[PDB]
Amino acid sequence: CRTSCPLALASYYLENGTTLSVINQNLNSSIAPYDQINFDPILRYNSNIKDKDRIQMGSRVLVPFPCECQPGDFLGHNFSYSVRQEDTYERVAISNYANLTTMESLQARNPFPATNIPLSATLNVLVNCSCGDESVSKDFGLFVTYPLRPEDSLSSIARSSGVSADILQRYNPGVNFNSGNGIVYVPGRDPNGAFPPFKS
């Protein structure tokens, strides 16, 4: 890979009842180790969360995770997921991982036929990330993998991220930020609200 960085952030949209524990379980990693007791690694990136035990539907939770070079020379991370009753690749992608992965990606990289995924199988779940692009800006080196929703637009994400629309578009060239699907990469802040800069 041409770029590298020590972490990325995943944007997990809340619907149908998701708790912080389930997010931490699904997105467990060395960077956010799930122990059911200490959620500080996640909470540091979400100062807006007043009560970790009662999170608000319709909001997004930012989760830090490692951002590693993958075969095929792109950046991402392999999460692991223990299969539960009635899981399907579609449901795991759209619901359990909140569009941070795709059903096609899951099906390609796991050996279970779509119609036979047994209880307690483990899935390899790929979520992509970015470390930035020096030709766009030297000012950003931490990125949110942000699945687009119908309510998002370039202007709304620019406003909420505090990053200019032109910079956002240059990081995501040719991508319509109002399309309501797929992922865009948005510069993110450290726990104190500063943007970590790009690092070669």
Ligand X SMILES: *[C@@H]1O[C@H](CO)[C@@H](O[C@@H]2O[C@H](CO)[C@@H](O)[C@H](O)[C@H]2NC(C)=O)[C@H](O)[C@H]1NC(C)=O
Ligand Y SMILES: *[C@@H]1O[C@H](CO)[C@@H](O)[C@H](O)[C@H]1NC(C)=O
Ligand Z SMILES: *[C@@H]1O[C@H](CO)[C@@H](O[C@@H]2O[C@H](CO)[C@@H](O[C@@H]3O[C@H](CO)[C@@H](O)[C@H](O)[C@@H]3O)[C@H](O)[C@H]2NC(C)=O)[C@H](O)[C@H]1NC(C)=O
Task: Name the residue among 154, 161, 159 with its Cα closest to residue 180.
Answer: 154
Beta bridge partners of 11: 62
Nearer Cβ to ligand Z (109/170): 109
Q: x/- contact string, 56-95, with ligand Y (CB under 6 A)?
A: --------------------------------------xx
Whole-angstrom distance, CA of residue 66 vs CA of residue 74: 13
Q: Does 111 bind ligand Z (CB under 6 A)?
A: no
Nearer Cβ to ligand X (45/81): 81
Give the β-pairing of 8-13 and 68-70.
unpaired
Contacting range for ligand Z; rule: CB under 6 A; set: 70-78, 135-143, 160-168, 171-179: 70-78
Q: Does 28 bind ligand Z (CB under 6 A)?
A: no
Contacting range for ligand X; rule: CB under 6 A; set: 3-11, 100-108, 152-160, 192-200: 100-108
Does the annotation place 87 within a ligand binding site?
yes
Cβ burial of 167 (10 Å; 0-12, 13-18, 19+) is middle
Give the β-pairing of 143-147 and 8-13.
parallel
Nearer Cβ to ligand X (40/74): 74
- Cβ contact 102:156 at 8 Å: no
Give Cβ neighbours of residue 23 (< 8 Å, ≥ 6 apart).
12, 42, 61, 63
Whole-angstrom distance, CA of residue 133 vs CA of residue 154: 19
Does the annotation place 53 within a ligand binding site?
no
Shortest approach of ligand Z to residue 154 CB, angstroms? 32
Q: Return the beta strands (E) in 31-71 as ranges.
A: 60-65, 68-70
Q: Does 105 bind ligand Z (CB under 6 A)?
A: no
Nearer Cβ to ligand Y (95/178): 95
Whole-angstrom distance, CA of residue 197 vs CA of residue 200: 10
Indicate which of ligand X, ligand Z, ligand Y, none lies near residue 124 (CB less than 5 to 8 Å, by partner kind): ligand Z
Interface positions with ligand X (CB under 6 A): 13, 15, 28-30, 33-34, 72, 74, 76, 94, 98-99, 101-102, 104-105, 126, 128, 149, 181, 183
Interface positions with ligand Z (CB under 6 A): 68, 70-72, 78, 109, 124
Annotated binding site: 85-91, 113-119
